Design an enzyme around this catalytic site. Sequence first.
Site, PDB file in Angstrom:
ATOM      1  N   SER A 198       4.298   7.421   3.492  1.00 46.20           N
ATOM      2  CA  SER A 198       5.103   6.212   3.393  1.00 46.20           C
ATOM      3  C   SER A 198       4.599   5.277   2.301  1.00 46.20           C
ATOM      4  CB  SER A 198       5.141   5.469   4.705  1.00 46.20           C
ATOM      5  OG  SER A 198       3.949   4.725   4.889  1.00 46.20           O
ATOM      6  N   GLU A 199       5.466   4.331   1.930  1.00 51.16           N
ATOM      7  CA  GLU A 199       5.113   3.187   1.102  1.00 51.16           C
ATOM      8  C   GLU A 199       5.363   1.943   1.947  1.00 51.16           C
ATOM      9  OE1 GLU A 199       4.432   5.278  -2.391  1.00 51.16           O
ATOM     10  OE2 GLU A 199       5.757   3.648  -3.089  1.00 51.16           O
ATOM     11  N   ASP A 216      -4.587   9.560  15.553  1.00 47.17           N
ATOM     12  CA  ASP A 216      -4.996   9.088  14.203  1.00 47.17           C
ATOM     13  C   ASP A 216      -5.726   7.750  14.328  1.00 47.17           C
ATOM     14  OD1 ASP A 216      -5.235   9.669  11.463  1.00 47.17           O
ATOM     15  OD2 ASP A 216      -3.550   8.351  10.974  1.00 47.17           O
ATOM     16  N   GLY A 237       0.804  -1.206   0.000  1.00 47.20           N
ATOM     17  CA  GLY A 237       0.000   0.000   0.000  1.00 47.20           C
ATOM     18  C   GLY A 237       0.845   1.267   0.000  1.00 47.20           C
TER      19      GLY A 237
HETATM   20  O1  LIG Z   1       2.968   2.352   9.953  1.00 44.52           O
HETATM   21  C1  LIG Z   1       2.253   1.872   9.045  1.00 44.52           C
HETATM   22  N1  LIG Z   1       1.509   2.612   8.126  1.00 44.52           N
HETATM   23  C2  LIG Z   1       0.789   1.783   7.358  1.00 44.52           C
HETATM   24  N2  LIG Z   1      -0.073   2.293   6.453  1.00 44.52           N
HETATM   25  C3  LIG Z   1      -1.002   1.540   5.584  1.00 44.52           C
HETATM   26  C4  LIG Z   1      -1.770   2.565   4.720  1.00 44.52           C
HETATM   27  C5  LIG Z   1      -2.814   1.835   3.847  1.00 44.52           C
HETATM   28  C6  LIG Z   1      -3.806   1.095   4.750  1.00 44.52           C
HETATM   29  C7  LIG Z   1      -3.052   0.062   5.603  1.00 44.52           C
HETATM   30  C8  LIG Z   1      -2.341  -0.947   4.690  1.00 44.52           C
HETATM   31  C9  LIG Z   1      -1.348  -0.203   3.786  1.00 44.52           C
HETATM   32  C10 LIG Z   1      -2.102   0.830   2.931  1.00 44.52           C
HETATM   33  C11 LIG Z   1      -0.301   0.521   4.658  1.00 44.52           C
HETATM   34  C12 LIG Z   1      -2.008   0.788   6.479  1.00 44.52           C
HETATM   35  N3  LIG Z   1       0.988   0.488   7.632  1.00 44.52           N
HETATM   36  C13 LIG Z   1       1.893   0.474   8.698  1.00 44.52           C
HETATM   37  C14 LIG Z   1       2.342  -0.575   9.419  1.00 44.52           C
HETATM   38  C15 LIG Z   1       2.048  -2.005   9.300  1.00 44.52           C
HETATM   39  C16 LIG Z   1       2.613  -2.913  10.210  1.00 44.52           C
HETATM   40  C17 LIG Z   1       2.355  -4.276  10.141  1.00 44.52           C
HETATM   41  C18 LIG Z   1       1.479  -4.760   9.171  1.00 44.52           C
HETATM   42  N4  LIG Z   1       1.146  -6.106   8.947  1.00 44.52           N
HETATM   43  C19 LIG Z   1       0.326  -6.194   7.943  1.00 44.52           C
HETATM   44  S1  LIG Z   1      -0.138  -4.709   7.166  1.00 44.52           S
HETATM   45  C20 LIG Z   1       0.890  -3.852   8.276  1.00 44.52           C
HETATM   46  C21 LIG Z   1       1.191  -2.500   8.311  1.00 44.52           C
END
Ligand SMILES: O=C1NC(N[C@]23C[C@H]4C[C@H](C[C@H](C4)C2)C3)=N/C1=C\c1ccc2ncsc2c1
Length: 329
Positions: A50-51, A155, A45
């Site tokens: 961030s990415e 958030d 995502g």
């Molecule tokens: O700090 C973060 N920021 C985000 N942001 C996003 C933003 C969109 C919705 C969701 C999934 C993607 C796209 C990443 C959280 N993810 C993060 C952490 C994270 C840690 C562990 C984990 N295990 C499975 S998914 C996942 C995501």
Amino acid sequence: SGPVPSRARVYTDVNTHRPREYWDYESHVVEWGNQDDYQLVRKLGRGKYSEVFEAINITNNEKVVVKILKPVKKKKIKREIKILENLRGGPNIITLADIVKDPVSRTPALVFEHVNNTDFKQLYQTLTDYDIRFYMYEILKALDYCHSMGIMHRDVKPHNVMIDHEHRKLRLIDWGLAEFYHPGQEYNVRVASRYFKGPELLVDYQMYDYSLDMWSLGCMLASMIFRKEPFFHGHDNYDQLVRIAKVLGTEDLYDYIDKYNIELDPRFNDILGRHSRKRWERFVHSENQHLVSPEALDFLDKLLRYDHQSRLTAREAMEHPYFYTVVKD
Ligand SMILES: O=C1NC(N[C@]23C[C@H]4C[C@H](C[C@H](C4)C2)C3)=N/C1=C\c1ccc2ncsc2c1
């Protein structure tokens, strides 16, 4: 005159009683790992900041998530990092496992424990009344921990709650907007997603606290039990307060602004009007009735209050009758 000050009713002085280094994140020096320990597998995502990628730690073959930061002020990276380190091992808090920098592009990456997360739309579709109570209780464990540790997330929203339904396992993620609570501090109101913003942010009252997270939890609960996502669907920051006013009424709103002597942006004068406080039944239909119960509505009423000082604390919320089933189990 200007605005009337405010203190959190709980965990008021928790950071004062800590060593400076705990909250004075601008002094934090970052402990880097080795970037060559992680190979990216696939992209999960794009965020605002961030990415996010699935990766493997080649040291031990553990599955890992890597959040590569878009450019931000270093003090904001240190803040996110410090808060993650302070909260590590706390209940239902994502674990930060490492921090690496690309040695050429110099862009930093946070490495997290992996959650095998169920899709958000497929989950806010299959959730029983009991599942909601369970997961809400699990979120409140995270919020009571972080608040007791002097931190407000700022958030809270469904996207930042990662649930692995198969293992009945929940993690509150994305601490990139989180901040340390200090009595007397005026904070930035330009935080949180529009639909989850508390009134305090919308009227520009800066001396807010942990209770902000309790509003945004309320917004989540409402959308979950009434199956209307978002629940307060504003067109902008001004119309967001109007949407709220059309449900909570304007009498309580003007009492709230009067109590804290809030100078109201004159624009708002027009569009707010006069609105009665509505009853929760309006949002009950046959599609959602299985999730709506008198306890749930009592609980929701006590989160969604204009006056941040009168909302439930996390600890109080966990003691509410809505959770008597979960608590026994
Ligand atoms: O700090 C973060 N920021 C985000 N942001 C996003 C933003 C969109 C919705 C969701 C999934 C993607 C796209 C990443 C959280 N993810 C993060 C952490 C994270 C840690 C562990 C984990 N295990 C499975 S998914 C996942 C995501």
